[PDB]
Amino acid sequence: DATPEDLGARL
Amino acid sequence: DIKMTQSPSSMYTSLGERVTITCKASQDINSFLTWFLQKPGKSPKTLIYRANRLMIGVPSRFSGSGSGQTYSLTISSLEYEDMGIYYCLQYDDFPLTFGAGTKLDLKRADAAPTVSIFPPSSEQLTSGGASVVCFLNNFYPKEINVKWKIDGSERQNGVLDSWTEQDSKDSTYSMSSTLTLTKDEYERHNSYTCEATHKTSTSPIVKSFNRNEC
Amino acid sequence: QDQLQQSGAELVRPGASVKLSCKALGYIFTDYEIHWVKQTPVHGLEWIGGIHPGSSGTAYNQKFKGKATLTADKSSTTAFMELSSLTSEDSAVYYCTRKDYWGQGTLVTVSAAKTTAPSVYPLVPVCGGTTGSSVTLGCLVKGYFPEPVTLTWNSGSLSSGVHTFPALLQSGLYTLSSSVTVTSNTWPSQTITCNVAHPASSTKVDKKIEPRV
């Protein structure tokens, strides 16, 4: 459902 | 460090009622916020991500809004399943930061506590210890203060308190207060009192006994 | 799907270490960051840090830099968090999260306490104090370790008007108490008994509440 629009910035 | 100021901290509600909770970021967080609920002894459950996206499986009566520093979680019609503590989480920038949460609680008439005091049991007194128990049962709101007194003066330590969560049937709360001493310290005093102060009354509810009586 | 499953409860000694695991299922492990959160009664929720299984990148809460170490393992789609020099201040429930999904959490208890059976005492009303249509009796489960310890009244036959309070640490050990309320003409004509069991020490204790004097 949710995309890496939960984070993404590696780290 | 972004600070999330969440409010209200305590919510007194009724089923079917519409509920609005708010989180204010100390700076712009660009809608990178989640709203999650957590029930007693249970793990967090997310309701909303990215300020306004419904978590798959979550009922539509839940919705979020906001865009800069101000975001809101709205529950169109409160259900029993919804009781618990709500929290917002910003993840726009490290360190991840949380709101202090807001406690949702079912409202009802004010009820004073039913207070009972219990001298140490003989079995324990034989063990060498002496615990004086005191129950403050079925009251509302959850706000309550308890004070102990030996032969007239306040006893600060040796006291341990424990609370139940709101009862599912009567919507009240209950707390247990235990004052522990050694058999010997206990047998050097006579009157042990238990005092409960609660919104429902100015004068405290007093309950006590004397050792010399039994 | 959408799932994070965490390793079991941990009972560890002070000065020791522990490594917690978080199995990811239902999504592509190397596409999302996995984070760890600490939760304690006194301190609430605290972000510890995150790891991106894909790039192996990490970010830590300055407060845990040097205390916690995050790692991830592609082949078993499992994130790890290791804590060293445990100190009771580390006793807490730990969660892994993807920010939307949350693990069920792992309880970590830092204690030196050894397995200890609870002493169970009967709490009978103060001599007299019957004044009323009902009477409240109690049961105090003191000094046991570890949790849990389940208790019932009259082998479960009594459940209404019962209040079993959450256990609390009392000088290294656990203490619990429970109250039950029945109509005054019920007790003591009829017997009320407190059933307490402590699996850990294979303890099964039953005790009747007898009046005082």
Please give the sequence-ordered ranges of beta strands (E in DSSP) within chain C, or none if there are none. Answer: 3-6, 10-12, 18-25, 34-40, 44-51, 58-60, 68-73, 78-83, 92-97, 106-110, 119-123, 134-144, 150-153, 162-164, 168-170, 173-183, 193-198, 203-208
Q: How far is C13 from chain A (nearest CA, A)?
A: 31
> Strand B102-106 and strand B129-139: pairing?
unpaired
User: B153: helix, coil or strand?
Assistant: strand
CATH topology of domain B1-108: Immunoglobulin-like (2.60.40)
Q: Which of residues 80-139 of B touch C (CB under 8 A)?
A: 87, 89, 91, 94-98, 100-101, 114, 116-121, 123-124, 127, 129, 131, 133, 135, 137
> Are residues C164 and C149 in contact, defined by beta-carbon separation less than 8 angstroms?
no
Q: Which residues contact B122 (CB under 8 A, 6 or more apart)?
A: none
C1-112 and C113-211: same fold? yes
Query: Which residue of C lies nearest to B137 if distances are taken between CA atoms?
Result: C163
- Enumerate the β-bridge partners of residue B11: B104
Calpha distance C142→B124 (Å, rounded): 10
Phi/psi of residue C205, each to 5°? -120, 135
DSSP-derived secondary structure letter, B5:
E
Examine residue B141 and say whether the peptide bond preceding it is cis (omega within 30 degrees of 0): yes
Q: What is the CATH number of domain B109-211?
A: 2.60.40.10
CB pairs under 8 A between A and C: 30
Pick the CATH number of C1-112 from 1.20.58.110, 3.30.1280.10, 2.60.40.10, 3.90.1170.50: 2.60.40.10
Quote the longest CA-to-CA distance of chain B: 69
Instruction: Write out the two tokens for C31.
Output: 């596409």
Superfamily (CATH H level) for C113-211: Immunoglobulins (2.60.40.10)
Calpha distance C62→C60 (Å, rounded): 6
Q: Which residues contact B99 (CB under 8 A, 6 or more apart)?
A: B4, B5, B6, B23, B87, B88, B89
Q: How far is C50 from chain A (nearest CA, A)?
A: 6
Q: Sort B1 into a burial class: Cβ within 10 Å, 0-12 / 13-18 / 19+.
A: exposed
DSSP-derived secondary structure letter, C100:
S
| Residue of B45, B49, B116 to mutate when probing chain C, most C C-beta within 10 A | B116
The full set of domain ranges for chain B reads: 1-108, 109-211
The coordinates were experimentally obtained by: X-ray
The full set of domain ranges for chain C reads: 1-112, 113-211
* Start-to-end Cα distance in chain B: 59
DSSP string computed for B158-173: SEEEEE----TTT--E
Instruction: Write out the two tokens for B148.
Output: 């102990």
User: B143: helix, coil or strand?
Assistant: coil
Q: How far is B44 from chain C (nearest CA, A)?
A: 6
